[PDB]
Symmetry: D2
Subunit: 333 residues, 4 copies
């Protein structure tokens, strides 16, 4: 029973609350902070447009919600300086507001009396970034305190990149992620700092930038400077694909590329990276707990140019990787 807190009970925060419920034997969410009133908060817990109804009952009052007869403290402090985790013996705070991805801002959780902070996103000034199944062994139970669990796309790309580079070496690579729309995008054409994301999300293919390809280097140093890419946001509510095209010096074939993924995708790592030969479409990978679902039927090769494609549920898959990482932290003060 390692006692967990959630800062920012949004898509990832609520996906995380459910993942813990359905997957963890040893964690407990005992406090959450969120800018929403508790009626809204509990409604959005009980009903979900993507995951469906929560298995259990939810009640609320002015400073709590109660899920399956278990009382949870709730705060509404839009600056985490004004919080007090310590008061609920809270060991870890998932930082999923998306506004405290700077560790200098996030560490504030520690100041409020937390031991760990896992930011549910690419970060800055953090102690360490991890994609579970890729670089989790270099967690430092003593020094690694404010950390990143990286991005959905990085948790898709890195597993697959690592294997294929470990095997054939990647010289250069460029990625397109065709990605479900997310909450930062606008429903109607409206204000946004990014002039494409300003555009009505559910009727547009929307190009946008992503650090996810560069960010791979945070977990695979050997690929620094070797990878870049961008995203096409498309009208599905969840479910995404990472399409990577790359150059190798090795002689390769489709078969050899596919057999390497297949070979590697077993055991504990297989809980992160899956190998498929199924006729998949995006709805088939909704609620899939892998970080990366390699699609063997999409593999292409001309000369020493290779295209490979991997799926991920950007909500649920990512969240399952964030739970793995959290179990690790939780197993070692």
């Amino acid at each position: 029973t390692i006692r967990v807190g959630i800062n920012g009970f949004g898509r990832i925060g609520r996906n995380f609350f459910r993942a813990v419920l359905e997957r963890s034997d040893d964690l407990e969410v005992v406090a959450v902070n969120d800018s929403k009133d508790n009626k809204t908060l509990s409604t959005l817990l009980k009903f979900d447009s993507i995951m469906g109804r929560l298995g259990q009952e939810v009640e609320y009052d002015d400073d709590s919600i109660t899920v399956g007869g278990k009382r949870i403290a709730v705060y509404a402090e839009r600056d985490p300086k004004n919080l007090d985790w310590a008061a609920h013996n809270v060991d870890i705070v998932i930082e999923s507001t998306g506004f405290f991805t700077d560790a200098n801002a996030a560490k504030a959780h520690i100041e409020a009396g937390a031991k760990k902070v896992i930011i549910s996103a690419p970060a800055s000034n953090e102690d360490a970034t991890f994609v579970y199944g890729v670089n989790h062994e270099s967690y430092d139970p003593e020094n690694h305190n404010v950390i990143s669990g990286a991005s959905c796309t990085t948790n898709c790309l890195a597993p697959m990149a690592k294997v294929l580079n470990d095997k054939f070496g990647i010289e250069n690579g460029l990625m397109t992620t065709v990605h479900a729309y997310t909450g930062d995008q606008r429903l109607h054409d409206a204000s946004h700092r990014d002039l494409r994301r300003a555009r009505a999300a559910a009727v547009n293919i929307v190009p946008t930038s992503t650090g996810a390809a560069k960010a791979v280097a945070l977990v695979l140093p050997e690929l620094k400077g070797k990878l870049d890419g961008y995203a096409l946001r498309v009208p599905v509510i969840t479910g995404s694909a990472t399409d990577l095209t790359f150059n190798t010096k090795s002689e390769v074939t489709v078969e050899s590329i596919n057999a390497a993924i297949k070979e590697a995708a077993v055991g504990e790592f297989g809980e992160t990276l899956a190998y498929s030969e199924e006729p998949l479409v995006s709805t088939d990978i909704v609620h899939d707990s892998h970080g990366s679902i390699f699609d063997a039927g999409l593999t292409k090769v001309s000369g020493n140019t290779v295209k490979v494609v991997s799926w991920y549920d950007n909500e649920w898959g990512y969240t399952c990787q964030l739970l793995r990482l959290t179990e690790l932290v939780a197993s070692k003060l």
Copy 2:
């Protein structure tokens, strides 16, 4: 030329801008206020996910945008007290932020120099509310200075209700509007004061309240207390339909209900209310300039109970109604 300012360059503000280019010979938009920087504003004006590309070159600088060679002063004041419409000799302000539907607040525009204010929405404390085609002949240029052009749904409902009440007598009625999603709804399940409008707009049927059927009484006072209804937000980006079930003492048939609309839907009034026997779906009424398109194929009659359905592009149709009102105001004394 009558000079117009727009406060709130959003969906309705930008439809209104284009409507003026496309349909007015005597209005010109000379200043706009909005919270966006001018690079953002000009981009959203040039490119539109519903109306397509503006047919004119657009440039911007620190103080302005220029559209087909005409400079438009641009401000970014959250508080309208800080505007200066008089500097631009603006006659009429379209209030389309959604934040100043109280006339006690919208009157700031008048104090900042405007002569008239038309709120793009149900208002309070307003001098008068109008649905063009229904009650605009009661516009009073000396006493009606801050006015409402009502809601999209009311502009769809009121014309059809006037005809049917005038010819048959509506005793009682309940409406459902099946309505395109709008910008306040959430893309992903997230915080909202309305617990249903919180839910991912583009994958849900979302019920929501609307005063639109009660508000008909503002323009047809003979129907106070007689109409109510509600909305179902559905996944289309624009285009809507109003479904009205009502009772009459008159003896009626599908045919006589339909003839009653066809008879009335001519001349000037027919620019507000259309009569159709076409096999319409919502994309067919996208960029229709009527406030109300009556679908004769959907009329049903059971005893003394009648169901009628009228379409409306809640963006462009409503805007064209607002533009009709605007032209009326501009045609008369602005003193």
Copy 3:
């Protein structure tokens, strides 16, 4: 264990299959007939854009599919005369192709050795039409052999109409169903006998006819001649609502209308009709097993005119109703 065949392994057929696995102790689907090859048939069982992945393993060979170890025999006969259900000991056939809603055509399943046929749609020339929870107690094991489970919309409307008519009396009413798009509609503007259903389904509000308001008269003959209505197909893949506006002679309030549903919506009937005060949107009723989910928050009253709204998952809720009817047929005399 009563053994079941499905003719038409489409949206309803495959929902019905999953409903049996998940909800039934005493039925088993052992044979299916469809137009698809076994690879295609198994792919579409295994993977589902709405229901997600089957939680059983699916394999195939060239005369069968295997699901959690159970061999299901597979046919691809366009003409049901050419089937043989008796070779599989099938007592009941679900007729879910959409092409054999005439009971004179569907009776070919009985010629081919079945005992009972349940058409998953409005039918013609049928022995009897049922909405489970409304008129199923009139099922006659000897003489009701080829029957209808009526439509999705009828299974939403009838339970609500029965309670309100029993309590207050319904003089007249007109219905609008706001309904998920269905396989009859076109993805792109293209040929259809219905010129509105011809139009790209996922970008349009599409008006179309519905027989649900006549059909309620079949299971509730007190409402003969009293109801009419239509449908608006909208861009959701499943999930629908029935909006009924009616006149009553009773003096009624929002509260008394709601209380009547809440009072009725209990026990076994409560598995057909639920009563809700939740802030529902369509996704919230996806995979709900009720035929009808009354939304108390949408009730309106103007004098003696009432507007009520009930939800339904037109795929899964209807299928659960159809399963309830199947369980009843299966619980009685299948013989003659």
Copy 4:
């Protein structure tokens, strides 16, 4: 006025009809053949979920439609051998059913009195295949009678690939086209020879195959065997992007890739290929008349690996390409 018949009055057929009215001074559609009855056909001409309402009045009866006072003969022959284009003095037939992309089937239109046939798709056994702006100068009026206008995707990729191959040299490249759903796909999970295209089109990203990149070789033989790729079908109703990642021996920068397109995208060729630095999304390119709209803002370079992205309205863009080709045919012998 050169007189045009349309076989297959579908999405492409009706796009073409409207493209002639809006864009041609010298072509007239005088006859159409389709499976539909005239009520249905006239309705789908008048009303379009993508294009909006036709500007002109539309009437029909048992053997015709009338558009803007112009009478169009209508037929419903499943088999093109039973047609008589000669009886309407038709010179060119647009073959847009999707069923006669084999030239040996499409030549039935010539037996039936047409002089030229333009297949609105990749063909087999055709006299020649053209991407207007890339290879149309090789059109041979005497020998090229049953021709192909290639695919939407090839019309997007080939102009871009020609420019970039000319300037820098393409060793190999692999394409992903993120494409609008099309009529071949299913609305609900349902029968289909392609187990991905079986899946409900408007709620899925759907991978499927395409010969569009190999087919570039037909108009640019120098790229034979150098390109392949596939499609992801996504839930927009029209509007697509071609994403090409390729290898060059050249040392290249983002700026020099972009500059190469900009320099090329001028004059007549620039009606086929546009250069843009705008913050484009798919709805911006709906009803765009170009075959290819190069998005300069998405170009990336890593070492010797280059990624470029061009937009296309797979309906109207393609159709405008197909009309350009048609205009060329109309302007030479027969």
